[PDB]
C-alpha cells in the first residue's frame, strides 16, 4: 500500500523522457553553433548540462504540492539552499536506475565511460563522484525505489536548515509528514528491511556534504575563470 501523501508527491514528478530530450536538444544546438576553434571544455559542457537540469528542477518545484503555496521569496530561499543537493540526488538516482559498472549516465540519456570522465574531471571531482558512486551502490543494495526517491526529494527541498522563512511552519510540517509517510511506506513494502528507513535518511547528510563540497569546488572554478558565464548555474552559486 502507498500512503496518500506519497501518491501526491508522485503526481508532481516531471515526465523524464521529455525533460531529457529537451536538454539533449538544447546542447546539440549549442554545439552546432560553435565553430572549429571554439572548442568547449568537457567541464564546460557539464556546466551547461547541469545548468539546463536546474531549469527543469525549478519548474518541477514551482508546480509541486506545498511548494506552490509558498510566496516567491520563501520559494527562492528553499531552492537557494538545496539546488546542488537536488542535482546530486537526481544524478545518484539516475545511476541507481540506469547505471552500469564503469559508466555514467547523463541527464541527456548519454552513457559515458568512467575512464574517459576520470581522465578529464580532476582529483576533486573524481573524489566527489566516487563518494556519490558509493551512495549509488549502497542505495542499489537497499532496493531504493521511486516512491522513496520522491520522498527524499521533498525532504531535501523542505529543509529545516533554511532561515528567515515567512512560513517556516509549512516547511516543518512537510518535513514531518513526509518523514512519517516514508517511515510508513518502508514498513509496509519492505517489512524485512529494518535498516532501510535509517539507511535512507543517513544518505541525506552525505548528499548534503557531497553537494556543498561540489558547490565550493564550482565556485572555485568560476573564480578561476573556467565556467561558461551568465547562466542559472552561476546565479545559484553566488546567491
Amino acid at each position: 500500500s502507498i500512503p496518500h501523501l506519497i501518491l501526491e508527491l508522485l503526481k508532481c514528478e516531471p515526465d523524464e523522457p521529455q525533460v531529457q530530450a529537451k536538454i539533449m536538444a538544447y546542447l546539440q544546438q549549442e554545439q552546432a553553433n560553435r565553430s572549429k576553434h571554439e572548442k568547449l571544455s568537457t567541464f564546460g559542457l557539464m556546466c551547461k548540462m547541469a545548468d539546463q537540469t536546474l531549469f527543469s528542477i525549478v519548474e518541477w518545484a514551482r508546480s509541486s504540492i506545498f511548494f506552490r503555496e509558498l510566496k516567491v521569496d520563501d520559494q527562492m530561499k528553499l531552492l537557494q539552499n538545496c539546488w546542488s543537493e537536488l542535482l546530486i540526488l537526481d544524478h545518484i538516482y539516475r545511476q541507481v536506475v540506469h547505471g552500469k559498472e564503469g559508466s555514467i549516465f547523463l541527464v541527456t540519456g548519454q552513457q559515458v565511460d568512467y575512464s574517459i570522465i576520470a581522465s578529464q574531471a580532476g582529483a576533486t571531482l573524481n573524489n566527489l563522484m566516487s563518494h556519490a558512486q558509493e551512495l549509488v551502490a549502497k542505495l542499489r543494495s537497499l532496493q531504493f525505489d521511486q516512491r522513496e526517491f520522491v520522498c527524499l526529494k521533498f525532504l531535501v527541498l523542505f529543509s529545516l536548515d533554511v532561515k528567515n522563512l515567512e512560513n517556516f511552519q509549512l516547511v516543518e510540517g512537510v518535513q514531518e509528514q513526509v518523514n512519517a509517510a516514508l517511515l510508513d511506506y518502508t514498513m509496509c513494502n519492505y517489512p524485512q528491511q529494518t535498516e532501510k528507513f535509517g539507511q535512507l535518511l543517513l544518505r541525506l547528510p552525505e548528499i548534503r556534504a557531497i553537494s556543498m563540497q561540489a558547490e565550493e569546488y564550482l565556485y572555485y572554478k568560476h573564480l578561476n575563470g573556467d565556467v561558461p558565464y551568465n547562466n542559472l548555474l552561476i546565479e545559484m552559486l553566488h546567491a
Binding site: F55, Q75, E235
Partner: peptide, 11 residues
C-alpha cells in the same frame, strides 16, 4: 537572484 525570481513568476 532576479533570474530565479523570474523563473518562479513567469507566465
Amino acid at each position: 537572484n532576479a533570474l530565479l525570481r523570474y523563473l518562479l513568476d513567469k507566465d
